[PDB]
């Protein structure tokens with residue numbers, strides 16, 4: 325359906341290498357039930373000038389927001405994970421994650437179904453200069469996860485997420501796992517994705533807003549935790565990621581301990597070489 329061939333494919337889905345703002349267009353319209361991601365944030369993003377990173381970043385991301393509006397079903401949701409950030413050499417917060425919010429409702433026309441908040445106890449990006457050293461700010465440990473929806477009535481059922489009705493606050497930490505992806509990464513002498521989220525994050529939203537066989541898309545795949553979860557929960561998925569290293573290593577997530585190291589490198593390099601692996605069988 326897309327203008328390319330997936331890096332790899334499994335039982336319920338397939339991951340592509342490429343720019344998601346292009347690939348999204350290949351989806352029919354009102355076809356996606358849940359788009360779940362956490363955008364790449366480093367000093368702005370693709371947009372010339374350098375006017376106020378806050379604004380440049382916002383415009384960049386709003387582009388994806390626009391196309392995602394079209395492709396989401398009327399009962400569809402667009403959950404977005406954002407991490408706080410200070411500005412260069414000053415202990416004043418950037419409010420880029422909040423600017424996205426306002427312009428998404430005002431300009432794009434989304435609705436904030438509900439604002440969620442993720443507390444990750446163990447978080448290293450905590451800026452030592454302001455916290456540990458100067459002792460002027462506290463551990464930056466809460467991420468603004470915005471659950472957006474195409475209409476005021478997106479598909480949702482909190483009983484599949486029952487704790488006892490749970491709250492607005494999700495307390496999860498990145499590693500409550502060991503897994504073969506970390507091991508297989510170590511094998512290739514490569515580093516695991518620099519910034520990936522715990523499986524429980526997308527699990528919560530996959531279970532709550534979608535039913536089995538629903539299409540869960542992730543426009544900034546990374547290590548593909550989403551597709552992984554969407555797989556073991558029996559939803560259909562599709563992920564887009566720009567970097568081949570990330571896609572290649574992510575494939576490991578869909579294998580077992582019982583695989584020759586010689587076969588792992590083959591899978592890694594073949595994907596890194598542009599081949600289309602059908603992981604469903606060898």
Ligand SMILES: Nc1ncnc2c1ncn2[C@@H]1O[C@H](CSCC[C@H](N)C(=O)O)[C@@H](O)[C@H]1O
Nearest residue numbers: 343344364520521544545546547549565566
């Ligand atoms: N325009 C683009 N299209 C597709 N992927 C993109 C992109 N711009 C940035 N990316 C990818 O966006 C990812 C953001 S981090 C993704 C982490 C993911 N949730 C997981 O747990 O790993 C980064 O890997 C970045 O390389």
